């Protein structure tokens, strides 16, 4: 079956090179073409280029001589390389399996890439537990605050995923060079504190992970 | 270069209804040789990567439901969903493939449902955040509707404007509601000088805004 996974840096400084790898599974790069599409934070899709089967490459006129696409059939990978970077290049990068015209077109999960001078910094994870004695009820909402990181993105799950129902993870808001996000989870009063509730935060750009169990105030 | 102008920007509809969006290309996308129009429609659900719904202006991809229908030729095309369901919540894009792929600005399809009052939760700063000199008070407003809701923070009865960051989750495609996070960021210094901390959620759903608050002591 088809599988495309892109691997990139996460944070790259302006005027530096950017290299993203797209590893494919279940098909030959010699039979299908592979293009690159980007999407700036909260904006539309921008086609960057494509590497065809016969090996021919085509790029978007916008980034004429700044972008290059190549591949290694042995390694079963395609690479996007960009130089003379601009902060506008900050975006989610996707590789997609395409054909001349027809069925197949399947995209990868994409990778986030930010072009900036800011230095990458890991997040601080604070537990958001209830008022203690201010409001009992059937439902109870716990939280997890993630602040002070750079760059995006950050990942949050509750109880390593076993708890995904009634979860609300809010988008990050840039707060002066650093990012802040929060996630809430609502559960029955029967579970917490009885059964345990932990949020798991992952910040790949800093190769960090934090588990914070939510304990009664 | 080919420019794709899409419309409408955003559409609001009730489950079961029907809607259409148009895509107009700066030039004909009809290829005389293959007698084909190179235009496709992509669906991007909140948080996932785009998925092609239709290729060659009117050919549903493998697995796409019948309610999705595309048409047009030359410079004018349109997409239609027979009975817009909940899972249809997403942003729709059209891509022309006559010359160097280009994407439309996109069409944001949202769902309409009945007014719903938010479930509000207030969280004082955590013991461990305090120890670092920071003091965030968090307020969660969950599962409400419509989107436009306001949040006012009141420190000791005085409305504070500085240090508030707000985040709205994409529309939940299950209950069609929204959720938002409100964070009042203060220094441990100013936080410990005041005592009453409140979060007010005034919304259409109620003449009297929903209030939740606490006191440090
Ligand atoms: Zn060729
Ligand atoms: Zn150059
Ligand atoms: Zn090799
Ligand atoms: Zn919800
Ligand atoms: Zn003061």
XYZ file of C-alpha atoms and ligand atoms in Angstrom:
439
model
C 0.000 0.000 0.000
C 1.002 3.643 -0.586
C 2.778 5.522 2.216
C 4.575 8.856 2.137
C 6.324 10.302 5.185
C 8.165 13.602 5.131
C 11.082 14.344 7.436
C 12.437 17.843 7.868
C 14.292 20.151 10.325
C 11.427 22.023 11.999
C 13.369 25.242 12.512
C 15.842 26.617 10.002
C 17.522 30.063 10.074
C 16.992 32.585 7.263
C 19.766 32.398 4.700
C 20.500 28.725 5.375
C 19.496 25.676 3.351
C 16.401 23.603 3.857
C 16.212 19.921 3.121
C 13.093 17.769 3.472
C 12.992 14.030 2.829
C 9.959 12.168 1.543
C 10.219 8.433 2.059
C 7.760 6.419 0.031
C 6.385 2.887 0.512
C 4.374 0.575 -1.702
C 5.369 1.951 -5.095
C 8.197 2.800 -7.447
C 9.308 6.369 -7.933
C 10.047 5.418 -11.527
C 6.409 4.689 -12.314
C 4.763 7.649 -10.545
C 5.571 11.331 -10.170
C 6.051 13.061 -6.804
C 5.257 16.730 -6.226
C 5.701 19.134 -3.349
C 2.938 21.353 -1.988
C 3.260 23.824 0.845
C 0.778 25.651 3.044
C 1.699 28.690 5.145
C 0.201 28.929 8.628
C -3.541 29.358 8.005
C -3.426 29.972 4.254
C -3.931 28.260 0.922
C -2.041 25.532 -0.853
C 0.973 26.419 -3.005
C 2.326 23.960 -5.515
C 6.127 24.017 -5.423
C 7.211 21.454 -8.011
C 7.338 17.836 -9.216
C 9.848 15.065 -10.037
C 8.441 12.818 -12.757
C 9.064 9.205 -13.591
C 11.367 9.766 -16.561
C 13.221 11.957 -14.023
C 12.131 15.378 -15.385
C 11.500 18.117 -12.862
C 9.274 21.196 -12.959
C 9.062 24.046 -10.494
C 6.703 26.901 -9.633
C 7.850 30.192 -11.209
C 7.647 31.975 -7.845
C 10.696 30.252 -6.392
C 12.545 29.922 -9.693
C 16.155 29.115 -8.788
C 15.643 28.690 -5.049
C 14.099 25.239 -5.062
C 15.323 21.860 -6.230
C 13.817 18.403 -6.281
C 15.701 15.111 -6.586
C 15.297 11.432 -5.645
C 17.187 8.155 -4.914
C 15.241 5.058 -6.094
C 17.539 2.812 -4.128
C 16.731 4.729 -0.906
C 13.184 5.148 -2.124
C 13.216 8.853 -1.187
C 12.579 12.239 -2.795
C 14.201 15.428 -1.529
C 13.144 19.033 -1.558
C 16.039 21.487 -1.236
C 15.641 25.248 -0.817
C 18.243 27.971 -0.433
C 18.080 31.771 0.060
C 15.362 31.160 2.619
C 12.716 33.749 3.564
C 10.431 33.800 6.588
C 7.552 33.418 4.070
C 8.817 29.898 3.434
C 7.617 28.985 6.902
C 4.913 26.427 6.188
C 3.586 22.872 6.337
C 5.316 20.879 3.597
C 3.608 17.927 1.840
C 4.796 15.439 -0.787
C 2.232 13.710 -2.944
C 2.121 10.679 -5.235
C 0.624 11.772 -8.557
C 0.077 10.440 -12.060
C -0.347 12.228 -15.412
C -4.093 12.401 -15.007
C -6.097 9.994 -12.911
C -6.485 7.996 -9.645
C -3.712 7.630 -7.102
C -3.094 11.191 -5.876
C -2.281 10.489 -2.186
C -0.616 13.021 0.124
C 1.640 12.558 3.099
C 0.992 13.852 6.608
C 3.300 16.794 5.904
C 5.951 18.411 8.124
C 6.065 21.816 9.732
C 8.983 24.076 8.862
C 9.584 27.523 10.264
C 12.227 29.947 8.970
C 13.415 32.101 11.876
C 16.271 33.548 13.905
C 14.574 32.792 17.201
C 16.357 30.008 19.097
C 14.404 26.814 19.644
C 13.232 26.475 23.246
C 11.326 23.524 24.917
C 7.910 23.900 26.547
C 7.011 24.145 30.232
C 4.066 21.969 31.175
C 1.694 23.042 33.947
C -1.252 20.966 35.265
C -4.677 22.539 35.395
C -6.608 20.879 38.213
C -10.076 21.952 39.587
C -10.789 24.548 42.339
C -10.613 21.651 44.945
C -13.827 22.743 46.787
C -15.673 25.258 44.485
C -17.883 23.087 42.230
C -18.671 19.328 42.299
C -20.700 17.803 39.479
C -21.067 14.825 37.184
C -18.534 16.233 34.708
C -15.096 17.554 35.527
C -12.733 19.364 33.236
C -8.982 19.089 33.736
C -6.342 20.925 31.726
C -2.746 21.106 30.660
C -1.001 24.376 29.854
C 2.016 24.309 27.515
C 3.956 27.552 27.463
C 7.204 29.036 26.302
C 8.110 26.872 23.327
C 9.451 27.510 19.835
C 8.837 26.508 17.108
C 5.530 24.891 16.368
C 4.187 22.397 16.576
C 3.573 20.686 19.892
C 1.588 17.512 20.466
C -0.726 16.770 23.345
C -2.587 13.597 24.188
C -4.303 12.425 27.336
C -3.319 9.115 28.933
C -1.128 8.307 25.968
C -4.220 8.465 23.780
C -6.531 6.143 25.729
C -8.486 9.284 26.446
C -9.382 11.110 23.209
C -13.092 11.674 23.745
C -14.087 15.057 25.165
C -10.653 16.534 24.547
C -10.050 20.109 23.342
C -6.581 21.177 22.337
C -6.437 24.783 21.335
C -4.299 26.299 18.566
C -1.064 27.981 19.649
C -0.933 31.750 20.029
C 2.424 33.423 19.577
C 3.211 35.355 22.750
C 6.372 37.428 22.011
C 8.730 35.057 20.101
C 7.381 32.078 22.118
C 4.274 29.914 21.774
C 1.563 28.998 24.266
C -1.144 26.354 23.972
C -3.555 24.610 26.298
C -5.619 21.433 26.218
C -8.655 20.547 28.266
C -10.303 17.205 28.885
C -13.719 16.619 30.411
C -14.345 13.367 32.223
C -16.866 11.883 34.712
C -16.361 12.505 38.424
C -16.143 8.693 38.897
C -12.718 8.549 37.104
C -10.794 11.518 38.577
C -9.212 11.393 41.003
C -10.017 7.623 41.225
C -8.419 6.571 37.920
C -5.417 8.679 36.786
C -5.303 11.521 34.172
C -2.013 12.540 32.559
C -1.333 14.800 29.611
C 1.623 13.924 27.385
C 3.365 16.757 25.620
C 5.722 16.266 22.723
C 7.911 18.952 21.167
C 9.923 17.284 18.385
C 11.891 20.413 17.389
C 13.511 20.229 20.845
C 13.524 16.435 21.110
C 11.576 16.728 24.306
C 8.565 15.008 25.894
C 6.810 15.697 29.192
C 4.211 13.692 31.101
C 2.306 15.586 33.777
C -0.218 13.704 35.899
C -3.100 15.955 37.020
C -3.340 15.811 40.821
C -6.019 17.336 43.115
C -5.394 20.912 44.128
C 0.603 32.042 -15.362
C -2.882 30.766 -14.533
C -4.774 32.348 -11.624
C -7.660 30.510 -9.898
C -10.325 32.653 -8.240
C -12.615 30.644 -5.966
C -15.893 31.482 -4.240
C -17.544 31.755 -1.956
C -14.904 32.310 0.704
C -16.946 30.674 3.469
C -20.307 28.874 3.443
C -22.634 28.102 6.325
C -25.204 25.334 5.879
C -27.448 22.916 7.807
C -26.962 19.154 7.621
C -29.007 17.721 4.774
C -28.834 20.859 2.625
C -27.072 21.393 -0.706
C -24.388 23.893 -1.681
C -22.151 24.758 -4.594
C -18.831 26.615 -4.965
C -17.298 27.936 -8.146
C -13.789 28.011 -9.543
C -12.944 30.368 -12.408
C -9.580 30.031 -14.178
C -7.749 32.983 -15.699
C -7.680 31.006 -18.948
C -9.173 27.873 -20.484
C -8.086 24.606 -18.904
C -9.523 22.586 -21.739
C -6.979 20.444 -23.602
C -7.970 19.897 -27.239
C -5.672 16.911 -27.626
C -7.045 14.720 -24.813
C -10.436 16.512 -24.819
C -10.005 16.963 -21.072
C -10.303 19.791 -18.600
C -7.469 19.565 -16.126
C -9.112 20.643 -12.866
C -9.604 18.819 -9.613
C -11.252 19.497 -6.263
C -9.537 18.806 -2.939
C -11.023 18.398 0.540
C -9.074 19.354 3.614
C -10.709 18.455 6.909
C -9.571 20.233 10.080
C -6.127 18.950 11.046
C -5.686 16.468 8.193
C -3.955 16.724 4.811
C -5.906 17.436 1.574
C -7.634 14.612 -0.305
C -8.579 14.835 -3.976
C -12.348 14.405 -4.441
C -12.536 14.851 -8.198
C -10.233 14.840 -11.212
C -10.801 15.938 -14.814
C -13.478 18.388 -13.706
C -16.111 15.685 -13.088
C -14.724 12.265 -12.214
C -15.193 11.229 -8.594
C -12.076 9.666 -7.159
C -12.039 6.087 -5.834
C -14.231 6.021 -2.731
C -15.736 9.515 -2.823
C -19.513 9.561 -2.116
C -22.066 10.361 -4.789
C -23.247 13.578 -3.098
C -20.046 15.270 -4.377
C -20.447 16.527 -7.960
C -18.236 18.646 -10.125
C -18.940 20.230 -13.469
C -17.979 22.975 -15.859
C -15.673 23.252 -18.845
C -13.209 25.775 -20.181
C -13.054 28.543 -17.594
C -16.055 27.943 -15.357
C -16.440 25.006 -12.987
C -18.405 24.253 -9.826
C -18.540 21.729 -7.004
C -21.749 20.514 -5.423
C -22.619 18.419 -2.406
C -26.130 16.929 -2.624
C -26.893 16.754 1.072
C -24.034 18.276 3.082
C -23.436 15.978 6.042
C -21.407 16.700 9.221
C -18.158 15.037 8.157
C -18.202 17.364 5.132
C -16.970 20.131 7.396
C -13.691 21.243 5.751
C -12.072 23.643 3.290
C -12.441 22.901 -0.419
C -9.834 23.797 -2.985
C -9.702 23.465 -6.774
C -6.409 22.765 -8.584
C -5.773 23.412 -12.290
C -3.309 21.188 -14.127
C -3.206 22.775 -17.587
C 0.117 24.486 -16.854
C 2.231 24.473 -13.648
C -0.366 23.505 -11.001
C -2.140 26.406 -9.273
C -4.588 26.343 -6.347
C -7.711 28.336 -5.602
C -7.909 30.450 -2.449
C -10.318 27.837 -1.037
C -13.936 27.497 0.171
C -14.580 27.071 3.944
C -17.699 24.944 4.528
C -19.095 25.298 8.052
C -22.192 23.740 9.635
C -25.104 25.562 11.243
C -26.818 24.330 14.375
C -28.857 25.668 17.264
C -27.507 28.088 19.820
C -25.530 26.391 22.589
C -24.212 28.006 25.775
C -20.574 27.346 26.680
C -19.478 25.233 29.595
C -17.016 27.473 31.448
C -14.072 26.405 33.612
C -11.590 28.676 35.448
C -8.120 27.553 36.542
C -5.788 29.541 38.801
C -2.065 29.372 38.117
C -0.394 26.084 39.218
C 1.982 25.778 42.191
C 4.859 24.934 39.879
C 4.250 27.806 37.471
C 4.310 30.180 40.436
C 7.798 28.974 41.407
C 9.062 30.306 38.056
C 7.736 33.856 38.469
C 4.826 33.456 36.077
C 1.097 33.353 36.844
C -1.423 32.295 34.166
C -5.093 32.089 34.939
C -6.883 29.893 32.411
C -10.522 29.844 31.386
C -12.084 27.178 29.100
C -15.349 27.793 27.245
C -16.415 24.473 25.774
C -18.996 23.230 23.274
C -20.811 26.457 22.386
C -22.433 28.118 19.351
C -22.399 30.405 17.483
C -18.714 31.247 17.257
C -18.787 34.959 18.068
C -18.565 34.969 21.854
C -16.709 37.455 24.070
C -14.632 36.882 27.216
C -13.852 39.556 29.815
C -11.416 39.088 32.629
C -11.963 40.883 35.936
C -9.229 41.216 38.571
C -10.768 42.246 41.904
C -13.779 43.420 39.958
C -11.722 45.505 37.546
C -11.691 44.487 33.910
C -8.113 43.693 32.888
C -7.255 43.954 29.212
C -3.501 43.309 29.245
C -2.089 39.799 29.014
C -5.053 37.991 27.515
C -4.586 35.482 24.688
C -7.525 33.735 23.012
C -7.828 30.550 20.969
C -10.723 29.027 19.013
C -10.735 25.421 18.040
C -11.905 24.558 14.524
C -15.547 23.619 14.332
C -16.216 20.216 15.866
C -17.701 18.047 13.091
C -19.603 15.926 15.632
C -21.755 18.474 17.518
C -21.001 21.426 15.191
C -19.857 23.599 18.094
C -16.746 25.521 18.987
C -14.558 25.785 22.054
C -12.137 28.484 23.045
C -9.390 29.043 25.559
C -8.785 32.314 27.339
C -5.539 32.924 29.169
C -4.754 35.843 31.432
C -1.002 36.056 31.787
C 0.396 37.981 34.732
C 3.644 37.984 36.716
C 3.669 36.230 40.066
C 4.074 39.766 41.423
C 0.837 41.384 40.237
C -1.083 38.077 40.668
C -0.349 37.949 44.401
C -1.330 41.588 45.003
C -4.956 41.028 43.951
C -7.475 38.457 45.195
C -10.606 38.147 43.018
C -10.106 36.578 39.582
C -13.075 36.165 37.258
C -13.962 34.987 33.762
C -17.155 36.239 32.077
C -18.565 34.610 28.940
C -21.251 36.832 27.427
C -22.893 35.147 24.468
C -26.036 35.383 22.356
C -27.352 32.219 24.036
C -27.988 34.197 27.259
C -28.772 37.772 28.331
C -26.750 37.250 31.496
C -23.157 36.218 30.644
C -21.911 32.922 32.161
C -19.556 33.686 35.046
C -16.929 31.648 36.856
C -14.243 32.924 39.196
C -12.139 32.233 42.293
C -10.062 33.908 45.030
C -6.435 33.114 45.895
C -6.868 33.053 49.667
Zn 9.650 13.445 -20.086
Zn 20.485 30.844 -5.557
Zn 21.448 5.464 -3.834
Zn -16.364 19.320 21.682
Zn -2.674 46.068 39.997
